[PDB]
Write a protein that binds this ligand. Structure first.
Ligand code: N7M
Ligand code: N7M
Ligand code: ZN
Length: 257
């Protein structure tokens, strides 16, 4: 099965998922001087006031905080997007060390972690249909640097002891994802893919310029999770990030000068 180890990590994925070598793969390096400011880009509209978180799940590759996506409760609109995209889950990718962990990079800089708020285009009815479409998903990516704690992350941090191993889930209601956002919603955008198998080329990536800061203790708690199931040999869930992929025939656009 695919993973992030020596024998099943990102360099092996193409053997089962040949789209890994496709034309619009993610993540990418964001070369900030080559990105083009597009004044026709609209501000992002993040409407999370009615969000309903339900559960948190260790899926063996990351942990997902899942939301009720059966109504337009937490939606992303505007920016480069046409129509309305519903929040289904968020998760993170992180490193074994503060010097690495993000999937996207900025002028080759790696951040300690990267948050992905995953949304699907309501015109396609559900997530499974949306991933089959070139405009099916919008993923809002937010970098994490280590410094001051992020108070809105602590509720996530504190439940991780309950989902240490693959397949464990826990109730996780009333979590407000607005507590994970930075001040500014300035962003870069480009067409790309899921960054894990099946690597489907269905994502409008929206990557925020401003990172959030989390404490060293917060990210250390991410690194105590396990990729394995309970009663299997323990392998720490760290370095669950795919490296930057070739940009190919793509231009990254910026919402800001
Ligand atoms: N990254 S990938 O192409 O999906 C892949 C799948 C299986 C493996 N190896 C495997 O299954 N070995 C048997 C031990 O469990 C390695 C990589
Ligand atoms: N890292 S990423 O490109 O944001 C990503 C998002 C969703 C998936 N797959 C998925 O099934 N998401 C919804 C889970 O219920 C895989 C990769
Ligand atoms: Zn992700």
């Amino acid at each position: 099965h695919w993973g992030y180890g020596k024998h099943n990590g990102p360099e092996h994925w193409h053997k089962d998922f040949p789209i890994a070598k496709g034309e619009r793969q993610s993540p990418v390096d964001i070369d900030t001087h080559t990105a083009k400011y597009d004044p026709s880009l609209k501000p992002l509209s993040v409407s999370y006031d009615q969000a309903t978180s339900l559960r948190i799940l260790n899926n063996g590759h990351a942990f997902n905080v899942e939301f009720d996506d059966s109504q337009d409760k937490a939606v992303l609109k505007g920016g480069p997007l046409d129509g309305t995209y519903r929040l289904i889950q968020f998760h993170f990718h992180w490193g074994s060390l503060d010097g690495q962990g993000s999937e996207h990079t900025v002028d080759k800089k790696k951040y300690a972690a990267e948050l992905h708020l995953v949304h699907w285009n309501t015109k396609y009815g559900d997530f499974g249909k949306a991933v089959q479409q070139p405009d099916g998903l919008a993923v809002l990516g937010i970098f994490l640097k280590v410094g001051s704690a992020k108070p809105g992350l602590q509720k996530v941090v504190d439940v991780l002891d309950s989902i240490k191993t693959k397949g464990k889930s826990a109730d996780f209601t009333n979590f407000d994802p607005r507590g994970l956002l930075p001040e500014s919603l300035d962003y870069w955008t480009y067409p790309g893919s899921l960054t894990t198998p099946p690597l489907l080329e269905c994502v409008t990536w929206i990557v925020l310029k401003e990172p959030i800061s989390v404490s060293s203790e917060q990210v250390l708690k991410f690194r105590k999770l396990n990729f394995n199931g309970e009663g299997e040999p323990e392998e720490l869930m760290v370095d669950n990030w795919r490296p930057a992929q070739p940009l190919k025939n793509r231009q990254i656009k910026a919402s800001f000068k």
